[PDB]
From a paper:
The successful analysis, of spike with FI-3A Fab, revealed a pre-fusion spike with one RBD in the 'up' configuration, atop of which was density consistent with the variable domains of a single bound Fab. The binding modes are identical between the cryo-EM and crystallographic structure determinations and further analysis therefore focusses on the higher resolution crystal structures. FI-3A and FI-1C target the head and neck (left shoulder of the torso) of the RBD and are typical neutralizing antibodies that block the binding of SARS-CoV-2 RBD to ACE2 protein. For all of these structural studies the viral antigen was based on essentially the original Wuhan strain.
The trimeric spike glycoprotein on the viral surface is the prime antibody target since the spike plays an essential role in allowing the virus to attach to and infect host cells 8,9. The SARS-CoV-2 spike glycoprotein is composed of domains S1 and S2. The S1 domain contains the receptor-binding domain (RBD) that specifically binds to the cell receptor human angiotensin-converting enzyme 2 (ACE2) and some RBD-bound antibodies block the interaction between the RBD and ACE2 receptor, which lead to the neutralization of SARS-CoV-2 infection. In conclusion, we report fully human neutralizing antibodies that target non-overlapping epitopes on the RBD of SARS-CoV-2, functioning with mechanisms that involve inhibition of receptor attachment and the fusion process.
Residue numbers in the entry:
A (entry chain C): 99 to 143, 165 to 172, 188 to 242, 264 to 293
B (entry chain Y): 1 to 116
C (entry chain Z): 1 to 107
D (entry chain B): 343 to 516, 522 to 585
E (entry chain A): 440 to 488
């Protein structure tokens, strides 16, 4: 459990609001205050919203002022690369924050990819879950 | 040397106009509450108009729409523009720095406006 | 509009006698009532402000009391130069209104 | 229902966001002597969504409640709290002589008496600088033509209604704040015109046989037609 | 020039409340007291009446 949280925003220097999400070891906390961040905000080895609650995949996106956060967890036995296979990510959070993001940073090996506007064919089985997909431009 | 000196009064035909100037010394007019008060001959005192420090203007019902009050910061002078003058407007017109606190209440000496 | 009533209209008393006039308000004016002395021909001169407070320089013989709607103005010992017309005014609530006035003469 | 209220010159501002606003607690209360709304209807407020709501609270004289309105002038409207001419909100007031007046006289509540110019809409002036009313400068020292810009209310119980303290709350409507939008009971095996969370239609709702996921709401047939829904209150699929 | 007065002309009126919107060319001149609250007015003006 090295990786702990995320910071999203535009400047992240107490000049504009910025999303801060931190899982302190039992508690998930999401804030959008105009935090003043350190140069390297690491953890020991104006607020408009505030909420308090192996392989892990998340999808963060911001559309029309809504911040969609999808997630999925699964066990794994592998170190040097991502596992090959298919799995769908369910939605977990839909923040009405309305803050536009340009940049972000992690808080702790991980992997980052960038979405593109493509067309996909999704196969829904009898139980409503996605079991396979086909990229229509691959 | 705090004092109010005023002038501009005289005879004027009914329906005519007349402006009364009230020159000040010792304080700033544009920063104080100022008032015009008229006294008809033989009668009591009658409040006429007020300008606040911020500039809001208030007038009595008997001169509302006809009289106007203003000031000039460069000359430190309080004015009272009188229009559509009537015979019942004949009085001595005192200008006064309104009392707001201890010892700032000071009155002019009035000028005789005679509407005839 | 508020209406101040001032009694008596006229008054004559001997030198040194206690002189007291009243001023009843039509509405409650708290203690925001002032008193003026106007000698003949001259401008009004503020003596009492806020019902009971004496303006700086007024002789001690001038007094004032009252709150709400009924107020009083008292001269301790009347002096010859006290001859004048005395008015009451309220100023907190607009429009500003005056009293009927009280003429004072020496006996 | 706050215990302490602020002086009008230092008026308090609460920012309300991300909540369902129940305005029925207010316009159905008989404890308010003044309740005037501008650019909105009091009863029709539970059906309007807004981005932000601002609640400003302070204490003034009853005489000066009339100044908390668009286009008003006076010692309060000019120098303490000013509403714009295009105000969209509600002004609520009630007497608080039982709370904010002391026997010997309460002096904790203040109002600004001196200012060179009027306040702009929603301006909060908390200055303590000595007011330079004369030609000479004050240099932070009181005296002639140099007055403390604030004045103290003399809130005593024996004061007339116009002089007793009134507590005021100004709601400003500027979407994370919506009104209740209650629901009703549901009936099955009968043709109904229904409106679930975001969708509307006409049909018969029947006990289903499917197993929706915990996050799925609306079903869909092969030909992009609504087939089943998740009831927002009862965790049953229809 | 015709309908304004220095003291304010109030002879011209406008309806401010109604239980429903007027139908086309409908004319309503009734002076019934509008009940703005839950308390019946019974023809008596007052709070929410
Ligand atoms: C679908 O769910 C049912 C019970 O909800 C289960 O019995 C069935 O095995 C599931 N389908 C698959 C392919 O696992
Ligand atoms: C909603 O409230 C009703 C009672 O008002 C209760 O029976 C029901 O369990 C509640 N549903 C949820 C999801 O909390």
């Amino acid at each position: 459990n090295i990786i702990r949280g995320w910071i999203f925003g535009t400047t992240l220097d107490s000049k504009t609001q910025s999303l801060l999400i931190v899982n302190n070891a039992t508690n998930v906390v999401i804030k959008v205050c105009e935090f003043q961040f350190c140069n390297d905000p690491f953890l020991g080895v104006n607020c408009t919203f505030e909420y308090v609650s192996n392989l892990r995949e998340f999808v963060f996106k911001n559309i029309d002022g809504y911040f969609k956060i999808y997630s999925k967890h699964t066990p794994i036995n592998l170190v040097r690369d991502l596992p090959q296979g298919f799995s769908a990510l369910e939605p977990l959070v839909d923040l009405p924050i309305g803050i536009n993001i340009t940049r972000f940073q992690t808080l702790l090996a991980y992997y980052v990819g960038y979405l593109q506007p493509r067309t996909f064919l999704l196969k829904y089985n009898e139980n409503g879950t996605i079991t396979d997909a086909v990229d229509c431009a691959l | 040397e705090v004092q109010l000196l005023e002038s501009g009064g005289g005879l004027i035909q009914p329906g005519g106009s007349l402006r009364l100037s009230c020159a000040a010394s010792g304080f700033t007019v544009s920063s104080n509450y100022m008032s015009w008060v008229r006294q008809a001959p033989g009668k009591g005192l009658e409040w006429v108009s007020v300008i606040y420090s911020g500039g809001s203007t208030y007038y009595a019902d008997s001169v509302k729409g006809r009289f106007t009050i203003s000031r000039d910061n460069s000359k430190n002078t309080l004015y009272l523009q009188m229009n559509s003058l009537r015979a019942e407007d004949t009085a001595v017109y005192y200008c006064a720095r309104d009392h707001v606190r201890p010892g700032m209440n000071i009155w002019g000496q009035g000028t005789m406006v005679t509407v005839s | 509009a508020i209406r101040m009533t001032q009694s008596p209209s006229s008054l004559s008393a001997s030198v040194g006698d206690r002189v007291t006039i009243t001023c009843q308000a039509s509405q409650d004016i708290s203690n925001y009532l002032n008193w003026y002395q106007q000698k003949p021909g001259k401008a009004p001169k503020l003596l009492i402000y806020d019902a009971s407070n004496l303006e700086t320089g007024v002789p001690s013989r001038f007094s004032g009391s009252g709150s709400g709607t009924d107020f009083t103005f008292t001269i301790s010992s009347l002096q010859p130069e006290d001859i004048a017309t005395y008015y009451c005014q309220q100023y907190d609530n607009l429009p500003v209104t005056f009293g009927g006035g009280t003429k004072v003469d020496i006996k | 229902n706050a215990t302490r209220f602020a002086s009008v010159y230092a008026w308090n501002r609460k920012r309300i966001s991300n909540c369902v606003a129940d305005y029925s607690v207010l316009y159905n209360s008989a404890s308010f002597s003044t309740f005037k709304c501008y650019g909105v209807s009091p009863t029709k407020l539970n059906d309007l969504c807004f981005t932000n709501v601002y609640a400003d609270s302070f204490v003034i004289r009853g005489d000066e409640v009339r100044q908390i309105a668009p286009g008003q002038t006076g010692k309060i409207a000019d120098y303490n709290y000013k509403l714009p001419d295009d105000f969209t909100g509600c002004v609520i007031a009630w007497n608080s002589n039982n709370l904010d007046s002391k026997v010997g006289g309460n002096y904790n509540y203040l109002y600004r008496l001196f200012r060179k110019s009027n306040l702009k809409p929603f301006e909060r002036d908390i200055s303590t600088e000595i007011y330079q009313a004369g030609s000479t400068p004050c240099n932070g020292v009181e005296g002639f033509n140099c007055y403390f810009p604030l004045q103290s209310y003399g809130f005593q119980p024996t004061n007339g209604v116009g002089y007793q303290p009134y507590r005021v709350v100004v709601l400003s409507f500027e979407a994370t704040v919506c009104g209740p939008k209650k629901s009703t009971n549901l009936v099955k095996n009968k043709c109904v015109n229904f409106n679930f969370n975001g969708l509307t239609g006409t049909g018969v709702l029947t006990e289903s046989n499917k197993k929706f996921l915990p996050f799925q709401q609306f079903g869909r047939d092969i030909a992009d037609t609504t087939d089943a829904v998740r009831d927002p209150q009862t965790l049953e699929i229809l």
